Amino acid sequence: GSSGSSGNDDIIVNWVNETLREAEKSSSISSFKDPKISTSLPVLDLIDAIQPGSINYDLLKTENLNDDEKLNNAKYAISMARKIGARVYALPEDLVEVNPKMVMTVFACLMGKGMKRVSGPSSG
């Protein structure tokens, strides 16, 4: 749930964690500059957590990845985004190096659901 202050930019991380927690995922992040992101674990699981059936670990690697594999993972993650409707403008090449320069549109776009507004003072 959006328990807290729905709006801040720090929620971009909390959400990712929660969303995965409620989904019972083994992926997560610590900050916009998280290492695990290199494997696209938190970025891949985050999507599935919302729409089960898209991400198929079967095709994924998530095992001793490398400059080569790591990439394929980045390209796949972004691919799904658009599939579900996450028109993003970034490159999987920079994502492999946990670069917040391109990821700025990665998570942000996904967080598009978080930020919101209501008429009455409702918490959630």
Tab-separated table of N, CA and C in Angstrom:
chain	number	residue	atom	x	y	z
A	1	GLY	N	0.806	-1.206	0.000
A	1	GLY	CA	0.000	0.000	0.000
A	1	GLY	C	0.841	1.259	0.000
A	2	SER	N	0.236	2.375	-0.396
A	2	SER	CA	0.939	3.651	-0.446
A	2	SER	C	0.987	4.300	0.935
A	3	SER	N	1.257	3.489	1.952
A	3	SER	CA	1.327	3.982	3.324
A	3	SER	C	2.493	4.951	3.493
A	4	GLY	N	2.171	6.224	3.702
A	4	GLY	CA	3.201	7.231	3.876
A	4	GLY	C	2.909	8.499	3.098
A	5	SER	N	3.908	8.987	2.370
A	5	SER	CA	3.756	10.204	1.582
A	5	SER	C	3.798	9.893	0.089
A	6	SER	N	2.624	9.683	-0.498
A	6	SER	CA	2.526	9.372	-1.920
A	6	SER	C	2.855	10.597	-2.767
A	7	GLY	N	4.079	10.638	-3.286
A	7	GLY	CA	4.500	11.758	-4.108
A	7	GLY	C	6.007	11.904	-4.162
A	8	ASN	N	6.640	11.930	-2.992
A	8	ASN	CA	8.089	12.069	-2.911
A	8	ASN	C	8.778	11.220	-3.975
A	9	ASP	N	10.041	11.532	-4.245
A	9	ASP	CA	10.813	10.798	-5.241
A	9	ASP	C	11.503	9.592	-4.612
A	10	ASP	N	11.492	9.537	-3.284
A	10	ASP	CA	12.117	8.436	-2.560
A	10	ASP	C	11.238	7.191	-2.599
A	11	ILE	N	9.977	7.374	-2.973
A	11	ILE	CA	9.033	6.265	-3.051
A	11	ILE	C	9.375	5.335	-4.210
A	12	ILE	N	10.101	5.860	-5.190
A	12	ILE	CA	10.496	5.075	-6.353
A	12	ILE	C	11.195	3.787	-5.934
A	13	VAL	N	11.905	3.843	-4.810
A	13	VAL	CA	12.619	2.679	-4.299
A	13	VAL	C	11.716	1.826	-3.415
A	14	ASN	N	11.093	2.462	-2.426
A	14	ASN	CA	10.202	1.760	-1.511
A	14	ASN	C	9.191	0.912	-2.276
A	15	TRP	N	8.537	1.523	-3.258
A	15	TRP	CA	7.545	0.824	-4.067
A	15	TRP	C	8.126	-0.460	-4.650
A	16	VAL	N	9.255	-0.332	-5.341
A	16	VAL	CA	9.912	-1.482	-5.950
A	16	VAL	C	10.070	-2.620	-4.946
A	17	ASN	N	10.513	-2.279	-3.740
A	17	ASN	CA	10.707	-3.272	-2.689
A	17	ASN	C	9.378	-3.903	-2.283
A	18	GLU	N	8.436	-3.065	-1.862
A	18	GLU	CA	7.123	-3.541	-1.445
A	18	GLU	C	6.487	-4.403	-2.531
A	19	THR	N	6.291	-3.815	-3.706
A	19	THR	CA	5.689	-4.527	-4.827
A	19	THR	C	6.231	-5.949	-4.930
A	20	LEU	N	7.540	-6.092	-4.758
A	20	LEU	CA	8.182	-7.400	-4.830
A	20	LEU	C	7.871	-8.228	-3.588
A	21	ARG	N	7.870	-7.575	-2.432
A	21	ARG	CA	7.585	-8.251	-1.172
A	21	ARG	C	6.191	-8.870	-1.190
A	22	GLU	N	5.199	-8.067	-1.562
A	22	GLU	CA	3.818	-8.538	-1.620
A	22	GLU	C	3.665	-9.649	-2.654
A	23	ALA	N	4.560	-9.663	-3.636
A	23	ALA	CA	4.525	-10.674	-4.687
A	23	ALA	C	5.362	-11.891	-4.304
A	24	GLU	N	6.119	-11.765	-3.221
A	24	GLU	CA	6.966	-12.857	-2.751
A	24	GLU	C	8.135	-13.086	-3.704
A	25	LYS	N	8.762	-11.997	-4.136
A	25	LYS	CA	9.895	-12.078	-5.050
A	25	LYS	C	11.214	-12.065	-4.283
A	26	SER	N	12.285	-12.482	-4.951
A	26	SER	CA	13.605	-12.522	-4.330
A	26	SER	C	14.487	-11.396	-4.860
A	27	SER	N	13.863	-10.424	-5.519
A	27	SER	CA	14.592	-9.291	-6.078
A	27	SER	C	14.279	-8.010	-5.309
A	28	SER	N	15.239	-7.090	-5.292
A	28	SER	CA	15.069	-5.824	-4.588
A	28	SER	C	16.221	-4.872	-4.900
A	29	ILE	N	16.100	-3.635	-4.430
A	29	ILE	CA	17.129	-2.629	-4.657
A	29	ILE	C	17.354	-1.779	-3.411
A	30	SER	N	18.522	-1.153	-3.331
A	30	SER	CA	18.862	-0.312	-2.188
A	30	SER	C	18.778	1.167	-2.558
A	31	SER	N	19.101	1.476	-3.812
A	31	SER	CA	19.067	2.851	-4.292
A	31	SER	C	19.157	2.898	-5.815
A	32	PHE	N	18.996	4.092	-6.373
A	32	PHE	CA	19.059	4.273	-7.820
A	32	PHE	C	20.366	3.723	-8.381
A	33	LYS	N	21.349	3.540	-7.506
A	33	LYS	CA	22.648	3.019	-7.911
A	33	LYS	C	22.905	1.651	-7.286
A	34	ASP	N	21.919	0.767	-7.380
A	34	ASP	CA	22.039	-0.576	-6.828
A	34	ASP	C	22.772	-1.500	-7.796
A	35	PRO	N	23.633	-2.369	-7.248
A	35	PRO	CA	24.412	-3.321	-8.044
A	35	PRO	C	23.542	-4.415	-8.656
A	36	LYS	N	22.618	-4.942	-7.860
A	36	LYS	CA	21.720	-5.994	-8.321
A	36	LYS	C	21.043	-5.597	-9.630
A	37	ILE	N	20.892	-4.294	-9.840
A	37	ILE	CA	20.263	-3.785	-11.053
A	37	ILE	C	21.018	-4.241	-12.297
A	38	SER	N	22.325	-4.430	-12.152
A	38	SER	CA	23.162	-4.865	-13.264
A	38	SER	C	22.592	-6.120	-13.916
A	39	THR	N	21.961	-6.966	-13.106
A	39	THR	CA	21.371	-8.204	-13.602
A	39	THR	C	19.916	-7.995	-14.002
A	40	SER	N	19.378	-6.825	-13.677
A	40	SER	CA	17.992	-6.503	-14.000
A	40	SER	C	17.031	-7.374	-13.199
A	41	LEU	N	17.481	-7.821	-12.032
A	41	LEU	CA	16.662	-8.664	-11.168
A	41	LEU	C	15.484	-7.878	-10.599
A	42	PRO	N	15.785	-6.729	-9.977
A	42	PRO	CA	14.765	-5.861	-9.382
A	42	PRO	C	13.897	-5.179	-10.434
A	43	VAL	N	14.445	-5.022	-11.634
A	43	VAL	CA	13.719	-4.386	-12.728
A	43	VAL	C	12.843	-5.392	-13.465
A	44	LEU	N	13.279	-6.648	-13.478
A	44	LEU	CA	12.534	-7.709	-14.147
A	44	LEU	C	11.414	-8.235	-13.256
A	45	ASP	N	11.758	-8.569	-12.018
A	45	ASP	CA	10.781	-9.082	-11.065
A	45	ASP	C	9.706	-8.038	-10.772
A	46	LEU	N	10.109	-6.773	-10.757
A	46	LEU	CA	9.183	-5.677	-10.490
A	46	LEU	C	8.004	-5.713	-11.457
A	47	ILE	N	8.297	-5.952	-12.730
A	47	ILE	CA	7.262	-6.014	-13.754
A	47	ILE	C	6.344	-7.212	-13.534
A	48	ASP	N	6.936	-8.396	-13.439
A	48	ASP	CA	6.172	-9.619	-13.226
A	48	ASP	C	5.285	-9.497	-11.991
A	49	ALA	N	5.836	-8.920	-10.927
A	49	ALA	CA	5.096	-8.742	-9.685
A	49	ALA	C	3.739	-8.093	-9.943
A	50	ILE	N	3.673	-7.261	-10.976
A	50	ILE	CA	2.436	-6.578	-11.329
A	50	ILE	C	1.635	-7.382	-12.348
A	51	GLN	N	2.329	-7.925	-13.344
A	51	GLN	CA	1.681	-8.719	-14.381
A	51	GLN	C	2.377	-10.064	-14.553
A	52	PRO	N	1.861	-11.090	-13.861
A	52	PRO	CA	2.418	-12.445	-13.920
A	52	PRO	C	2.184	-13.110	-15.272
A	53	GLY	N	3.252	-13.633	-15.862
A	53	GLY	CA	3.142	-14.290	-17.152
A	53	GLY	C	4.081	-13.702	-18.185
A	54	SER	N	4.431	-12.432	-18.011
A	54	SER	CA	5.325	-11.751	-18.941
A	54	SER	C	6.751	-12.275	-18.805
A	55	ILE	N	7.380	-11.978	-17.672
A	55	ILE	CA	8.745	-12.422	-17.418
A	55	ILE	C	8.802	-13.930	-17.197
A	56	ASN	N	9.655	-14.602	-17.962
A	56	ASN	CA	9.807	-16.049	-17.848
A	56	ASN	C	11.244	-16.420	-17.495
A	57	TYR	N	11.510	-16.564	-16.202
A	57	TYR	CA	12.844	-16.915	-15.729
A	57	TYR	C	13.468	-17.990	-16.614
A	58	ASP	N	12.624	-18.850	-17.173
A	58	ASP	CA	13.093	-19.924	-18.042
A	58	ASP	C	14.009	-19.381	-19.133
A	59	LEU	N	13.611	-18.264	-19.731
A	59	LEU	CA	14.396	-17.641	-20.791
A	59	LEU	C	15.514	-16.781	-20.208
A	60	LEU	N	15.259	-16.203	-19.040
A	60	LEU	CA	16.244	-15.357	-18.374
A	60	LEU	C	17.457	-16.174	-17.938
A	61	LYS	N	18.485	-15.485	-17.453
A	61	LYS	CA	19.702	-16.145	-16.998
A	61	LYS	C	19.837	-16.051	-15.480
A	62	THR	N	19.974	-14.829	-14.978
A	62	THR	CA	20.111	-14.604	-13.544
A	62	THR	C	21.089	-15.595	-12.923
A	63	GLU	N	22.092	-15.994	-13.699
A	63	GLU	CA	23.095	-16.939	-13.223
A	63	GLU	C	24.463	-16.629	-13.822
A	64	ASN	N	25.409	-16.257	-12.964
A	64	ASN	CA	26.759	-15.932	-13.409
A	64	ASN	C	26.727	-15.117	-14.698
A	65	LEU	N	25.829	-14.139	-14.750
A	65	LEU	CA	25.695	-13.285	-15.924
A	65	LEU	C	27.048	-12.720	-16.345
A	66	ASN	N	27.058	-11.978	-17.446
A	66	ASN	CA	28.286	-11.378	-17.953
A	66	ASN	C	27.978	-10.268	-18.954
A	67	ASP	N	28.989	-9.466	-19.272
A	67	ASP	CA	28.827	-8.369	-20.218
A	67	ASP	C	27.896	-8.768	-21.359
A	68	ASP	N	27.954	-10.038	-21.747
A	68	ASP	CA	27.118	-10.546	-22.826
A	68	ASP	C	25.696	-10.804	-22.338
A	69	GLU	N	25.553	-11.763	-21.430
A	69	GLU	CA	24.245	-12.109	-20.883
A	69	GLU	C	23.566	-10.881	-20.282
A	70	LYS	N	24.246	-10.239	-19.337
A	70	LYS	CA	23.711	-9.052	-18.683
A	70	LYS	C	22.928	-8.192	-19.669
A	71	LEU	N	23.498	-7.990	-20.852
A	71	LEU	CA	22.853	-7.187	-21.885
A	71	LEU	C	21.492	-7.768	-22.256
A	72	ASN	N	21.502	-8.972	-22.818
A	72	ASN	CA	20.267	-9.639	-23.217
A	72	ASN	C	19.168	-9.416	-22.183
A	73	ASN	N	19.550	-9.429	-20.910
A	73	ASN	CA	18.598	-9.227	-19.824
A	73	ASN	C	18.042	-7.805	-19.844
A	74	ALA	N	18.924	-6.835	-20.058
A	74	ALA	CA	18.522	-5.434	-20.105
A	74	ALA	C	17.563	-5.177	-21.262
A	75	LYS	N	17.878	-5.742	-22.423
A	75	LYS	CA	17.044	-5.574	-23.607
A	75	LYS	C	15.667	-6.193	-23.395
A	76	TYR	N	15.636	-7.341	-22.726
A	76	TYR	CA	14.382	-8.036	-22.458
A	76	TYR	C	13.499	-7.221	-21.517
A	77	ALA	N	14.064	-6.823	-20.382
A	77	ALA	CA	13.331	-6.037	-19.397
A	77	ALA	C	12.586	-4.884	-20.060
A	78	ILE	N	13.330	-4.016	-20.737
A	78	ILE	CA	12.738	-2.871	-21.417
A	78	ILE	C	11.658	-3.311	-22.399
A	79	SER	N	11.920	-4.408	-23.104
A	79	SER	CA	10.970	-4.934	-24.079
A	79	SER	C	9.599	-5.140	-23.443
A	80	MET	N	9.578	-5.819	-22.301
A	80	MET	CA	8.331	-6.084	-21.592
A	80	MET	C	7.613	-4.782	-21.251
A	81	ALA	N	8.363	-3.815	-20.732
A	81	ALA	CA	7.797	-2.523	-20.364
A	81	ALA	C	6.775	-2.058	-21.396
A	82	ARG	N	7.233	-1.857	-22.628
A	82	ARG	CA	6.358	-1.410	-23.705
A	82	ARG	C	5.195	-2.380	-23.898
A	83	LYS	N	5.484	-3.671	-23.791
A	83	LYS	CA	4.464	-4.701	-23.953
A	83	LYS	C	3.246	-4.399	-23.087
A	84	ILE	N	3.476	-4.208	-21.793
A	84	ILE	CA	2.397	-3.910	-20.860
A	84	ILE	C	1.927	-2.467	-21.007
A	85	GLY	N	2.764	-1.637	-21.623
A	85	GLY	CA	2.415	-0.241	-21.817
A	85	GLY	C	3.261	0.690	-20.972
A	86	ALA	N	4.578	0.599	-21.129
A	86	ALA	CA	5.498	1.440	-20.374
A	86	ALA	C	6.452	2.182	-21.305
A	87	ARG	N	5.906	2.750	-22.374
A	87	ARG	CA	6.710	3.487	-23.343
A	87	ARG	C	7.859	4.216	-22.653
A	88	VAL	N	9.046	3.622	-22.707
A	88	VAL	CA	10.227	4.216	-22.089
A	88	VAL	C	11.256	4.615	-23.140
A	89	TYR	N	12.084	5.600	-22.804
A	89	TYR	CA	13.112	6.078	-23.720
A	89	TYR	C	14.502	5.922	-23.109
A	90	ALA	N	15.021	4.699	-23.143
A	90	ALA	CA	16.343	4.415	-22.595
A	90	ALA	C	17.025	3.288	-23.364
A	91	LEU	N	18.268	2.997	-22.996
A	91	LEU	CA	19.031	1.941	-23.652
A	91	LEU	C	19.490	0.893	-22.643
A	92	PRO	N	19.377	-0.387	-23.025
A	92	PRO	CA	19.778	-1.507	-22.169
A	92	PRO	C	21.290	-1.590	-21.992
A	93	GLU	N	22.021	-0.877	-22.844
A	93	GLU	CA	23.478	-0.873	-22.782
A	93	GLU	C	23.965	-0.197	-21.502
A	94	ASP	N	23.349	0.931	-21.166
A	94	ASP	CA	23.718	1.675	-19.967
A	94	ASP	C	23.134	1.020	-18.719
A	95	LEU	N	22.019	0.317	-18.893
A	95	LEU	CA	21.361	-0.358	-17.780
A	95	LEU	C	22.264	-1.432	-17.182
A	96	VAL	N	23.041	-2.089	-18.038
A	96	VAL	CA	23.953	-3.137	-17.596
A	96	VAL	C	24.974	-2.592	-16.603
A	97	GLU	N	25.287	-1.306	-16.730
A	97	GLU	CA	26.250	-0.665	-15.844
A	97	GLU	C	25.542	0.183	-14.791
A	98	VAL	N	24.370	-0.274	-14.363
A	98	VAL	CA	23.591	0.441	-13.359
A	98	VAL	C	23.767	1.949	-13.498
A	99	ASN	N	23.563	2.455	-14.709
A	99	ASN	CA	23.700	3.883	-14.976
A	99	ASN	C	22.372	4.604	-14.763
A	100	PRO	N	22.334	5.487	-13.754
A	100	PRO	CA	21.133	6.261	-13.424
A	100	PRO	C	20.810	7.311	-14.483
A	101	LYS	N	21.646	7.379	-15.515
A	101	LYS	CA	21.449	8.337	-16.596
A	101	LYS	C	20.320	7.890	-17.520
A	102	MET	N	20.204	6.581	-17.717
A	102	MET	CA	19.165	6.027	-18.576
A	102	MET	C	18.044	5.410	-17.744
A	103	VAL	N	18.388	4.948	-16.545
A	103	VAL	CA	17.410	4.338	-15.654
A	103	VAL	C	16.402	5.366	-15.155
A	104	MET	N	16.769	6.640	-15.247
A	104	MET	CA	15.895	7.722	-14.808
A	104	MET	C	14.500	7.569	-15.403
A	105	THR	N	14.434	7.020	-16.612
A	105	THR	CA	13.160	6.819	-17.292
A	105	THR	C	12.651	5.396	-17.099
A	106	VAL	N	13.536	4.513	-16.649
A	106	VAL	CA	13.176	3.118	-16.419
A	106	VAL	C	12.171	2.990	-15.282
A	107	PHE	N	12.643	3.197	-14.056
A	107	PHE	CA	11.785	3.104	-12.880
A	107	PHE	C	10.723	4.200	-12.894
A	108	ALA	N	11.163	5.440	-13.083
A	108	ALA	CA	10.253	6.576	-13.119
A	108	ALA	C	8.965	6.226	-13.856
A	109	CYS	N	9.101	5.790	-15.103
A	109	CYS	CA	7.947	5.422	-15.916
A	109	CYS	C	7.065	4.417	-15.183
A	110	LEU	N	7.692	3.404	-14.597
A	110	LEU	CA	6.965	2.373	-13.866
A	110	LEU	C	6.256	2.965	-12.652
A	111	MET	N	6.895	3.943	-12.019
A	111	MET	CA	6.324	4.596	-10.845
A	111	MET	C	5.129	5.462	-11.232
A	112	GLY	N	4.946	5.663	-12.534
A	112	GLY	CA	3.840	6.472	-13.011
A	112	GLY	C	2.532	6.129	-12.326
A	113	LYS	N	2.456	4.923	-11.772
A	113	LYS	CA	1.252	4.473	-11.083
A	113	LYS	C	1.221	4.987	-9.648
A	114	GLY	N	2.392	5.048	-9.021
A	114	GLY	CA	2.477	5.524	-7.652
A	114	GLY	C	1.863	6.897	-7.477
A	115	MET	N	2.567	7.923	-7.942
A	115	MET	CA	2.084	9.295	-7.834
A	115	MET	C	0.626	9.395	-8.276
A	116	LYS	N	-0.175	10.117	-7.500
A	116	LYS	CA	-1.588	10.292	-7.812
A	116	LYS	C	-2.191	11.423	-6.985
A	117	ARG	N	-3.472	11.700	-7.214
A	117	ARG	CA	-4.166	12.757	-6.490
A	117	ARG	C	-5.640	12.409	-6.301
A	118	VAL	N	-6.216	12.879	-5.198
A	118	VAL	CA	-7.619	12.619	-4.898
A	118	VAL	C	-8.291	13.849	-4.300
A	119	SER	N	-9.620	13.867	-4.333
A	119	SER	CA	-10.383	14.986	-3.796
A	119	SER	C	-10.411	14.944	-2.271
A	120	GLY	N	-10.764	13.783	-1.724
A	120	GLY	CA	-10.824	13.631	-0.282
A	120	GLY	C	-9.517	13.134	0.304
A	121	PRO	N	-9.264	13.482	1.573
A	121	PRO	CA	-8.042	13.078	2.275
A	121	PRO	C	-8.012	11.583	2.575
A	122	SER	N	-7.586	10.795	1.594
A	122	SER	CA	-7.514	9.348	1.752
A	122	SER	C	-6.064	8.873	1.751
A	123	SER	N	-5.734	7.997	2.695
A	123	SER	CA	-4.381	7.467	2.808
A	123	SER	C	-4.290	6.074	2.192
A	124	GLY	N	-3.807	6.011	0.954
A	124	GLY	CA	-3.677	4.737	0.271
A	124	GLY	C	-3.887	4.856	-1.225
